[PDB]
C-alpha cells in the first residue's frame, strides 16, 4: 500500500496473508468464513507451497492473535489467463477453521445486483495489505489500508495499456500518490455500507504503483458471487 | 426520481430488492432481519463485515 494509514487494532480483521516457505508474505487474501479465503489466481503461481496467516498487523512481532493455517484445497478459476489476468480469482479451503477474535473476522459477501447498484456506486472502497509502500520499495512490515475512489469504467479503459475486461474494475487516483502495490495482490477491496464491510474486489494488477494517469485494477467480485458460492460448496 | 431501493436503500440496513412495487430488505449470512423488516441483527459472535472491538 502506497500512502494510506496503518490498520489499527480491529480495523482490517478480514485481511489474510499468504506466506511462502521462508514465512514471508507474497500476497493477500480476504477471510470469507472460518474455512475459506478469497485470493487472486495469479498469486498461486508465486509460491510452490504456501500457508495462510491471519490476525497479523506487524510482521516484526508476535502480538498473540496471529494464526497460520494450512491450505487443504486450492480452487482456481478455470478461465484464469496469465496474459490478461482475466478471471483473476481463487478460493482456498483451509485444513482447520479460523478462530474469529480480535483482528480476525470475515468480510460479508454481498448479493450481486445490490452490490453493483449500491456498493460499487459509492464514492470509495478500501484496499488493504502488506504490499510495497512505493513502486520500487520493500514490502510493509505493517498492515495498511487506503480509501480508493471507484473509477469510471470509460476513464479506466482510456487510461490502460492493457485490456480491462468486465471481470475487472478500476479504483484509486489519477495523480495522487496512493494505490495498492506489489505484495497487496490477492488482498481485500471492501466497501463500507452503514458500518458493515462487504467484499467488492480482489487486488489484481496495475502498471506500476500510484503512477500518474494509471489506476489500480481489481477483480470484480460481483461477477463471481455464484462461483464463490459454489466453491465454498 | 428516486423511489424504493433507490431512495436511501429503501431504509434497509443491508440488501434491498424491489418486489412488485415495494422494498424488500434482507441481510448477509450470520444476520437476521429484525422485526421491523429493515434492520439486520447479528445472530452470533464475529458477524461478517464488522471491525473487531474485543
Ligand atoms: C495483465 N497484466 C498484469 C500486469 N502487471 C503489470 C505491472 O506493471 N506489474 C508490476 C511490474 C512487474 C511485477 C509486478 C508489478 N506489479 C505491481 O507493482 C502491482 C501494482 C498494483 C497496483 C494496484 C493494484 Cl489494485 C494491484 C497492483 C498489483 N501489482 S502491467 C500488467 C498487465
Ligand atoms: Ca505480528
Ligand atoms: Ca494514478
From Swiss-Prot, chain A:
Name of the gene encoding the protein in the UniProt record: F10
Outcome recorded upon mutating residue 88 to N: In FA10D; Stockton; 50% decrease in specific activity
Residues the record marks as active site: 42, 88, 185
Transmembrane regions listed in the UniProt entry: none
Effect the entry attributes to changing residue 22 to Q: Reduces activity for cleavage of PAR-2/F2RL1. No significant effects on factor Va (F5) binding and activity toward prothrombin in the prothrombinase complex (F10-F5)
Effect of residue 28 to D: In FA10D; uncertain significance
Species whose genome carries this gene: Homo sapiens
Impact upon substituting residue 140 to P: In FA10D; Marseille; decreased cleavage by factor IXa; normal catalytic efficiency for prothrombin
Protein name per UniProt: Activated factor Xa heavy chain
UniProt-reported outcome of changing residue 142 to A: Reduces activity for cleavage of PAR-2/F2RL1
Effect annotated for changing residue 172 to S: In FA10D; almost complete loss of activity
Domain Peptidase S1: 1-233
Effect upon mutating residue 72 to A: No significant effects on activity for cleavage of PAR-2/F2RL1
Disulfide pairings: 7-12, 27-43, 156-170, 181-209
Coiled-coil annotated spans: none
Consequence of substituting residue 156 to F: In FA10D; Padua 4
Domain of life: Eukaryota
Consequence of substituting residue 124 to M: In FA10D; Roma
Consequence of changing residue 132 to A: Reduces activity for cleavage of PAR-2/F2RL1
Swiss-Prot record, chain B:
Highest taxon above the source species: Eukaryota
Full protein name: Factor X light chain
EGF-like domain segment(s): 1-41
Disulfide partners: 5-16, 12-25, 27-40
Stretches assigned to coiled coil: none
Species assigned in the record: Homo sapiens (Human)
Gene that specifies this protein: F10
